[PDB]
Amino acid sequence: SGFRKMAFPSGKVEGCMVQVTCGTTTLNGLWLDDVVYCPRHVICTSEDMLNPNYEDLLIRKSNHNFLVQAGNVQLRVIGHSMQNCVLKLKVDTANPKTPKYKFVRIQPGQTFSVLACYNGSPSGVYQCAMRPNFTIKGSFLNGSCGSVGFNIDYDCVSFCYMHHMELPTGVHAGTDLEGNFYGPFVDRQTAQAAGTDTTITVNVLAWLYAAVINGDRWFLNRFTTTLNDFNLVAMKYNYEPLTQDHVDILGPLSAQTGIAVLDMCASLKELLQNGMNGRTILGSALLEDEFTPFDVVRQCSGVTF
Amino acid sequence: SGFRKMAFPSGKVEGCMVQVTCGTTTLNGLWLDDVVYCPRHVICTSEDMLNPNYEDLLIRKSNHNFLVQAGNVQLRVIGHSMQNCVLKLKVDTANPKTPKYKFVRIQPGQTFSVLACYNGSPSGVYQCAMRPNFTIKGSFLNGSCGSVGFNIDYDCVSFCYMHHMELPTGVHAGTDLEGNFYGPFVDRQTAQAAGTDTTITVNVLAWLYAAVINGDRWFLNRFTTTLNDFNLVAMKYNYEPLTQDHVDILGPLSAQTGIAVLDMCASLKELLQNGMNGRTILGSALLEDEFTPFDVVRQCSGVTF
Ligand SMILES: O=C1C[C@@H](C(=O)N(c2ccc(N3CCCC3=O)cc2)c2cccc(Cl)c2)c2ccccc21
Ligand SMILES: O=C1C[C@@H](C(=O)N(c2ccc(N3CCCC3=O)cc2)c2cccc(Cl)c2)c2ccccc21
Ligand code: NA
């Protein structure tokens, strides 16, 4: 028992992190097989960040202008290319620590672990969600660019995020590993609007199921609702509308607990309308939305990698 | 910017985890150099757990009764010995992935990362604190015994915790790596009192400093206090008394922010007495106490290992 915000064990990813330097600019890269992936703004000076012409900037660079260090080992760069907002540096050595891996583009509301890195060295790991507005609420300082987000299934690492920028509002933006931003963002030092965000309803409901499995049960009530009725409440409180596909995904937790999804929705509706009355659920005084239904089942069943 | 409950990168520890089986009972062990460390209740059956005579149970075991598997590496056991509540299995192979390491006994209020493991395989990592009453609020299922807690400083892993037990209250108890329990606990399936817990005041203050550094400043007030006055409030709210040693440890954050420690104490006093009025600090609606002053500085300054 217990329920924590648990990250994937980071060692398979740690072995892939390198330092990339171009002129005087340094950030992290990801070394998989004989390619290093990093944010393309490695080729910028501070002057350039306001409005970079990345194609013109990169034309000034040759292979020997990219220094890649993996611990104390220098890698030889033999090719470079830009793909969207990432650079791909071909190196003459396959990383011996390459895990089984895939690149995935995750959906809003999905979770992943971040390995925060500086100078190609890991500093910490934490779990977060992709917000409905395609930002993440991370913890990142200058130099953290090229830090990656991932999920692990048994021996296979699915990379989903590469960190690029902090917005002037203090939330974080980045790309998939093919260099396409999540959300409307561009890699330039400019104020940039993020959507209105919303709370990830299916995750809240998953966490309430977690709470019940752990014996926090005070918020269960004698009420039920309908999808339509609940969705009126969701709208008012800036929650995502619930769909039957969400109901289906919550079926395992419903069966495990015996609590019908729409009954748990009725519990949630009462918490939205009445608040928590100075009580807590799984150590939280807010409704928590950074656990997926898959996360709840995996933590509550001890799955390993 | 941003502030998250960040764990240490777990790779150096993942390479030390092994499966230990004795008869039909399986749990995790920690393979360092040519020794494997695990909880001594590996030698029990379910019927033994109510009142184990560990010395008598262990006298029935020889080296060949302990199976140790490191992935599919099967290790040969050439010696065994009990130290307090831990078994030490001497093996004929030094672990090639052994990090630089030390064993430490941490103090209540200090934090560490847990690598939760099952069958010798890592499932997740999360950060937690040693409570004032020497329990931890973890996430652990049957099979998790032998999972360890640690801190990393550059290249050196300081092991501080080995998981042993869930109490019937659903909080967790364990030992240092010399097998001595934190707290009054014994390794037996019996109800065991943990005694009154308290909030780790110096950590709450550290986290308020973190909040200020991150621009969450609404709780700063026009007031100051004294140590004595604050300690009366701490007592009423089951907070640890603040001492000048704690004030000294908070000096770096006080200097960074320009807020004198007793001024921050007065902000904390007002939050204790008035609550948060439906507001949040660093995404929490409670006062958080699982970050040490060293943790805040490390996260806010980007230190790597
Ligand atoms: O999470 C981050 C990463 C970083 C960031 O956001 N940058 C950034 C990247 C490179 C530089 N460089 C390059 C040359 C010398 C230098 O400092 C600076 C800032 C950024 C800004 C806007 C647009 C983009 Cl695409 C990127 C940052 C700075 C402060 C606090 C947090 C964070
Ligand atoms: O975090 C844990 C670890 C585990 C626990 O607490 N055990 C435990 C250890 C071994 C067995 N064994 C041995 C033989 C087959 C078997 O099941 C069982 C329970 C325990 C209980 C009381 C006293 C002590 Cl020292 C240990 C547990 C069970 C359920 C949920 C969570 C947790
Ligand atoms: Na997030």
Ligand code: NA
């Ligand atoms: Na983004």
Ligand code: NA
């Ligand atoms: Na303990």
